[PDB]
Design a binder for this molecule. Structure first.
Ligand SMILES: N#Cc1ccc(NC(=O)Nc2ncccc2OCc2ccccc2)c(O)c1
Ligand SMILES: O=C1CC[C@@H](N2Cc3cc(NC(=O)c4ccccc4)ccc3C2=O)C(=O)N1
Ligand SMILES: [Zn+2]
Lengths: 261, 802, 375
């Protein structure tokens, strides 16, 4: 049986259709349930090292896991971490399809940490959020950092110069305006579309560009509190995100546990 | 070194047994005194004791009895040694020549079994039909006394009772009957058995009883016509004979425990009792055929007695181990209270020797020892010529200060708790009758406490000049006299500990420095330590101290203080501490030898070698840079050496010498010329009062003496026909091994005592590597010269018999 | 330890209560050269008298155990100085008293319970062709020493050398005064001789243990000095070098003295990776088993853990849900405990299922992840 580094044992499958199928490993010396992302040495998408590096540069926080072991085993590269749990997405659609905005500020707090840690996730979807298990049952964790752009450069983090005519498919339903390179503003703009979320075809010019143009055809006020709709607008105007956080705390307090809990 | 020589300077003086009877002749009363390995025979005359014969045994005498079987002219002697050699001996005299004839001999050891904790018991029945030995728990060994039993064949019977205290043979029985007292979880009981030699089994005894005191220890077999037994306990004295029962609880015997007895009248009318303090009692049995009552009276005070014997004319022999043996007279009248004792003769006992020193080496050394305990403690000055200085308390440690011309003695006395919260002394002692007295600090039932003192003694008159009393609950352990640092003054340094009954391991102690100047003793400096200072030595102008398990080196500052230089931590306690140059020898009570060196440049301690073998150790010494001496469990000597031919072997000490001495060594000293081919000179003192000399030989001399020893064993007749090789073998309960690296000087010096034809037989075919260079057939004269040169390394014993 | 049975953890019921039980002994004579097989996976220091559970998976170990069952049932547990190069100087002989075999999952499993018997010294290690290790072994002796007074005692007091049995501070005063009466014939006092007396050392150890753990029944400890010392050494939560040091000791008195020295030196268990955080204190250690606070258990995959049972632990992180499968202590569910700093495996937290039991929450910690601090 596949023993990861002579210490773990892959018992079953928990997620697939991904770059790294996320297995459930078990420590043959401890008994702990473990999450293992496994990718081939000749796989088409080598995001395993990408996400491991992003976890490594994360190094702590209430939303970033701990890498138990990395390296490689024969033709299948491996990443062992703590068993994350259930996805925020696979909790919102399983439960029933205050909780929304209490989570949102937890997400908002998460992104300050990644922005202050000199990089960007850039791939925000409800799938990439996962609730913890046990002690972490109430804490948000952002994962799937394989598609996360690193702004670390020489000395202090320097945003790379913007380059027009760029493509984005990782955020299929949250692409929005993003030629404009994904950045801090682009992170928080996808969050507002995730909060909002809380005619296709094979041609991409109709399945992505038409969605984006309909997304920005009308102001956010008609689609939507309109006050936090215009917060979204002026958040996309991008410094300001500290202000946006204090304003969102004000909104959270001015409304007089979560869905599944 | 690797080859050593052991000789006896003073024979043991302590008495462990004594019997009376008719051994030399049927018309003469004889006293036989058993000292360690030495048997002395005396004839009882009106003037006193007349010595006739003294013999040496190849063993420690444990059992000594006199019996007269049917058809024999006089008494025969039964001896059992601590190595289980059993012999029956006869006294024969043909004109001037006197010999001890061996009638039967053998070894009665059992290959399996644990030795009894209460010891070895040997009894002979009044009808002279068997011998009963209690050697191992649960077994009783019987030796038939038929004429045709010359190898001493014995058989074992099983005892249901595992913990036996005492056992005796009863008088007036048709079959051999034994009576004994045993202990079980219920208490202590008295039981009897009958011994059948045909069936080799135990039969049912004539009577059984249960009412025995919880502190009963002694069984006394009363002869005819009374019969029965007397059981002596801490509070009561009882007489049991079938349905008869008598008990008394005299208030006079509660103070101390009765440890010895003897019979005065042939019919058991009177008995002598002695206790642990020196009181002599009389036990009187009243008669109508049958016994009426028991009475006890106090006779007086003698030495602390190990054994008592009556000499048929009102004279009693007191055989002591803690002090001098006495001959006393029992008078019908008295001085204060009825029937006192009067001393008439005193015999020297140097044991126990707990410490000693060598003084006046300018011109011929002298030995000063701390001897005795309790009221028998004294100082002995040995030149043999012996001088006694009674202290009336216990001497512990001693040292000599030449500048002050005085001795420093550590002592202790026993005081009892009075109602007033203080303590009261039992007798006037040296520490209470000193010229000048001082205390460290002043502080305020029937419980005994120990008070420790430091005594200053003049070297000419041996009077007490100054006594210093230490703190309450303080136990003084070490004492040195030395000069420290650049100070031109000589100091007395004492290492103490604080001992509280509720604490197992002492956590406090101190080192105190005293100076004796202008007739007074003053305190210069004191240092508080967090342990017990077991030993101290002078290390190249510094002070080496052993606190609990660590070794500390101190420096003497110009401000008159002790400053710590380096610490070394061990897993063992440093009970023993010796020094030669830059080397330090460390040892504990479990025979763990550690060799350390001082690195002067680095200022710390380095470990050179070690040897860990679990056994009980009593003393160690340094012979030279490589070889070290020690004393083992049982009564043994060992020698270890280093670097004999990687770091595994260089850090290991191996045993190059093993020997069975027969004595318990307490102290080693370098007495180079105490008594004015051999190298070095070390003296040791034992519990039995024996003083010995250890010197080092060369290869050639060792080989010659070993060959001569082997030849002498074939020509010298031993008493009991014990083999010298078996006697000198290293002995432990788990191991037995032949002796290596040691020459027995007593056997070598016995060569001068044999006849000339026997000398010719010994010296035949011996190749002598004379100083000329070429080996030639040795003659008796050359070996006589060698042996006389060997005897010159110690004094000469005087004649014993008249 | 109320309404809970202390004998349950000793039977190791998680392996199967239908073992084949073997009665009989085999003691090798002292100081002899013998060849004994070595199990290649065991990395434990075995103290004599200690129980070792094993689950063996590889075919060579199964063949070795099957051969051993028919012949003297002894294998060697080597106390490795460092497991890196598989070198060791001393070890112990273990004897099998329980054995069963299962053909589950298409493979062969052998379950063994073993007890330690004798200490030895390693002369030579041979790794023969098949892939197992046979060692040349010299059997170390057990040193029994008589009383210290057996060299100075006068024969007269030897009659009173036995004393009436125990009914006790006054009693121990009397015991010291009367047993070592002849200490004045030597250079040392009575308390020094008491410091080397096995009975007194055992009494002191029992007093200390009862002060730390009050539920300690009087008769739970053996009455023999050798067995007492071996049990105490087995139950002490110390590191490998100290266990090797205790295994090298041949005398029971020295072993007792070393154990007292270990106990007296202040200790608070800390994480091995961090060496800065304190997991538990010696006050919160209790004996949920008849063996004591520490014992050896085996997990489903054949790894032996030495678990220390403590009432309370600090700075531990719990991962996962309480699972009741394969629990070493019946009636409890375990949750994995990691260090709050280094995130290394320290042990488990056991929460009971019923409500009439006691205690309901406690912690089990592995010795290999614990380090004793000495100030
Ligand atoms: N049968 C049996 C039996 C044998 C042994 C034991 N206990 C023990 O060994 N140590 C023990 N116990 C309870 C509380 C504290 C304890 O020391 C903790 C400790 C000691 C040394 C270093 C560091 C920590 C028992 O409770 C039963
Ligand atoms: O008291 C105790 C005793 C048991 C002890 N375990 C339990 C355990 C299970 C495991 N996984 C498994 O078997 C397992 C389960 C499902 C599929 C594949 C494997 C691994 C290690 C440990 C381990 O060490 C523990 O945790 N606490
Ligand atoms: Zn840690």
């Amino acid at each position: 049986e596949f023993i990861v580094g002579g210490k773990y044992k892959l018992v079953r499958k928990i997620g697939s259709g991904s770059f790294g199928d996320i297995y459930l490993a078990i420590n043959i010396t401890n008994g702990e349930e473990v999450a293992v992302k496994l990718e081939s040495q000749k796989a088409r998408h080598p995001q395993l090292l990408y996400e491991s590096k992003l976890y490594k540069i994360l190094q702590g926080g209430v939303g970033i896991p701990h890498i138990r072991w990395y390296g490689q085993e024969k033709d299948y590269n491996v990443l062992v971490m703590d068993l994350l749990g259930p996805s925020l997405e696979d909790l919102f659609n399983f439960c029933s399809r205050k909780t929304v905005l209490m989570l949102a500020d937890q997400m908002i707090s998460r992104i300050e940490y990644v922005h202050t840690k000199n990089f960007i996730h850039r791939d925000i979807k409800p799938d990439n959020f996962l609730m913890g298990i046990g002690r972490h049952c109430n804490k948000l964790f952002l994962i799937d950092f394989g598609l996360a752009k690193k702004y670390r450069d020489n000395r202090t983090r320097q945003h790379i110069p913007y380059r027009e005519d760029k493509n984005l498919t990782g955020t299929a339903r949250y692409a929005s305006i993003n030629g404009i390179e994904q950045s801090r503003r682009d992170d928080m703009e996808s969050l507002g579309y995730v909060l909002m979320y809380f005619l296709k075809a094979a041609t991409k010019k109709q399945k992505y560009e038409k969605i984006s143009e309909k997304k920005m055809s009308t102001p956010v006020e008609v689609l939507c509190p309109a006050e936090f709709a215009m917060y979204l607008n002026y958040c996309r105007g991008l410094p300001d995100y500290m202000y946006l956080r204090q304003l969102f705390r004000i909104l959270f307090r001015t409304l007089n546990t979560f869905d599944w809990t | 070194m690797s080859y050593n020589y052991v000789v006896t300077a003073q024979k043991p003086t302590a008495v462990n047994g004594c019997v009376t009877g008719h051994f030399t002749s049927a018309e003469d009363l004889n006293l036989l005194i058993a000292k360690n390995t030495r048997l002395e025979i005396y004839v009882v005359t009106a003037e006193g004791l007349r010595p006739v014969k003294e013999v040496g045994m190849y063993g420690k005498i444990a059992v000594m009895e006199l019996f007269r079987p049917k058809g024999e002219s006089k008494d025969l002697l039964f001896i059992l040694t601590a190595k289980y050699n059993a012999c029956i001996l006869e006294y024969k005299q043909s004109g001037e020549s006197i010999d001890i004839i061996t009638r039967a001999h053998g070894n009665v050891q059992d290959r399996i079994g644990r030795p009894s904790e209460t010891g070895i018991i040997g009894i002979i029945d009044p009808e002279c039909r068997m011998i009963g030995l209690r050697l191992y728990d649960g077994l009783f060994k019987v030796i038939p006394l038929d004429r045709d039993n010359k190898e001493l064949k014995a058989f074992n019977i099983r005892l249901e009772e595992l913990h036996v205290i005492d056992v005796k043979f009863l008088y007036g029985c048709q079959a051999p009957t034994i009576c004994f007292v045993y202990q079980d979880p219920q208490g202590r009981h008295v039981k009897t058995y009958e011994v059948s030699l045909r069936e080799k089994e135990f039969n049912k005894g004539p009577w059984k009883q249960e009412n025995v005191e919880a502190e009963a220890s002694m069984v006394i077999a009363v002869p005819e016509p009374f019969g029965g037994a007397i059981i002596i306990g801490q509070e009561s004295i009882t007489y049991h004979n079938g349905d008869k029962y008598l008990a008394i609880a005299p208030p006079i015997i509660k103070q101390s425990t009765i440890v010895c007895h003897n019979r005065v009248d042939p019919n058991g009318s009177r008995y002598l009792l002695g206790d642990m303090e020196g009181r002599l009692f009389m036990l009187l049995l009243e008669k109508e055929v049958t016994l009426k009552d028991l009475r006890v009276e106090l006779l007086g005070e003698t030495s602390i007695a190990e054994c008592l014997t009556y000499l048929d004319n009102g004279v009693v022999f007191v055989g002591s181990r803690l002090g001098d043996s006495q001959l006393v007279k029992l008078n019908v009248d008295s001085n204060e209270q009825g029937s006192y004792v009067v001393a008439m003769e005193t015999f020297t006992n140097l044991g126990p020797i707990v410490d000693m020193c060598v003084v006046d080496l300018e011109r011929q050394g002298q030995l000063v020892t701390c001897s005795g305990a309790f009221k028998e403690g004294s100082l002995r000055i040995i030149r043999l010529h012996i001088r006694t200085v009674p202290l009336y308390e216990s001497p512990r440690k001693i040292c000599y200060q030449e500048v002050s011309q005085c001795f420093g003695v550590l002592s202790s006395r026993i005081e009892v708790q009075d109602t007033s919260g203080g303590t009261t002394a039992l007798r006037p002692s040296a520490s209470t009758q000193a010229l000048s007295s001082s205390v460290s600090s002043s502080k305020l039932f029937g419980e005994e406490v120990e008070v420790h003192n430091l005594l200053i003694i003049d070297q000419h008159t041996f009077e007490v000049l100054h006594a210093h009393q230490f703190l309450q609950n303080e136990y003084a352990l070490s004492l040195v006299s030395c000069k420290l640092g650049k100070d031109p003054n000589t100091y007395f340094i004492v290492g103490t500990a604080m001992v509280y009954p509720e604490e197992a391991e002492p956590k406090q102690g101190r080192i105190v420095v005293f100076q004796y100047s202008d007739g007074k003793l003053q305190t210069v400096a004191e240092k508080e330590v967090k342990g017990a200072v077991y030993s101290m030595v002078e290390f190249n102008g510094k002070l080496l101290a052993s606190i609990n398990s660590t070794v500390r080196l101190y420096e003497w500052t110009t401000e008159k203080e002790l400053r710590t230089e380096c610490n070394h931590y061990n897993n063992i306690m440093a009970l023993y501490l010796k020094t030669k140059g830059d080397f330090i020898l460390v040892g504990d009570l479990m025979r763990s030898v550690l060799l350390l060196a001082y690195k002067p440049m680095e200022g710390n301690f380095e470990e050179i070698a070690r040897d860990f073998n679990p056994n009980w150790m009593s003393a160690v010494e340094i012979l030279d840079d490589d070889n070290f001496l020690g004393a083992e469990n049982a009564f043994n000597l060992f020698v270890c050496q280093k670097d004999s031919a990687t770091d595994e072997e260089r850090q290991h000490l191996q045993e190059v010498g093993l020997f069975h001495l027969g004595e318990f060594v307490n102290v080693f000293c370098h007495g180079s010329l105490v008594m004015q081919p051999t190298q070095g000179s070390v003296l040791f003192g034992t519990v039995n009062g024996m003083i010995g000399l250890v010197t080092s030989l060369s290869e050639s001399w060792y080989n010659l003496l070993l060959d001569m020893q082997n030849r002498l064993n074939k020509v010298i007749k031993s008493v009991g026909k014990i083999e010298h090789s078996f006697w000198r073998s290293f002995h432990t309960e788990r191991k037995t091994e032949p002796a290596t690296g040691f020459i027995d000087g007593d056997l070598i010096e016995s060569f001068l005592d044999i006849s000339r034809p026997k000398m010719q037989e010994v010296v035949a075919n011996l190749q002598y590597d004379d100083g000329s260079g070429m080996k030639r057939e040795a003659t008796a004269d050359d070996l006589i010269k060698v042996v006389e040169e060997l005897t010159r390394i110690h004094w000469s014993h005087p004649q014993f018999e008249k | 330890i109320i309404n809970f049975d202390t004998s349950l953890p000793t039977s190791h019921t998680y392996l199967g209560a239908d073992m084949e039980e073997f009665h009989g002994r085999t003691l090798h004579d002292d100081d002899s050269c013998q060849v004994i097989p070595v199990l290649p996976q065991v990395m434990m220091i075995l103290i004599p008298g200690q129980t070792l559970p094993l689950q063996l998976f590889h075919p060579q170990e199964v063949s070795m155990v099957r051969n051993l069952i028919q012949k003297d049932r002894t294998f060697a547990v080597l106390a490795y100085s460092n497991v890196q190069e598989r070198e060791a100087q001393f070890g112990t002989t273990a004897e099998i008293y329980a054995y069963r075999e299962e053909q589950d999952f298409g493979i062969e499993i052998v379950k063994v319970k073993a007890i330690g018997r004798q200490r030895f010294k390693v002369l030579e290690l041979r790794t023969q062709s098949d892939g197992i290790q046979q060692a040349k072994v010299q059997i170390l002796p057990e040193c029994v020493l008589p009383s210290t007074m057996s060299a100075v005692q006068l024969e007269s007091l030897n009659k009173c050398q036995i004393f009436p049995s125990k009914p006790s501070y006054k009693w121990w005063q009397k015991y010291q005064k009367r047993k070592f009466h002849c200490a004045n014939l030597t250079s040392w006092p009575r308390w020094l001789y008491s410091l080397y007396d096995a009975e007194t050392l055992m009494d002191r150890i029992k007093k200390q243990l009862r002060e730390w753990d009050e539920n300690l029944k009087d008769d739970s400890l053996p009455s023999n000095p050798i067995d007492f010392s071996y049990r105490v050494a087995a139950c002490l939560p110390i590191d490998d070098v100290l266990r090797i040091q205790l295994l090298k000791i041949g005398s029971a008195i020295q072993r007792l003295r070393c154990e007292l020295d270990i106990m007296n030196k202040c200790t608070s268990l800390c994480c091995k990776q961090c060496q800065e955080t304190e997991i538990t204190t010696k006050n919160e250690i209790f004996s949920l088993s008849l063996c004591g606070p520490m014992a050896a258990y085996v997990n489903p995959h054949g790894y032996v853990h030495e678990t220390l049972t403590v009432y309370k632990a600090c700075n531990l992180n719990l991962i996962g849900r309480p699972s009741t499968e394969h629990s070493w202590f019946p009636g409890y569910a375990w949750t994995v405990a990691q260090c709050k700093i280094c995130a290394s495996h320290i042990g488990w937290k056991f929460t009971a299922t019923k409500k009439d039991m006691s205690p309901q929450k406690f912690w089990g910690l592995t010795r290999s992840a614990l380090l004793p601090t000495i100030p």
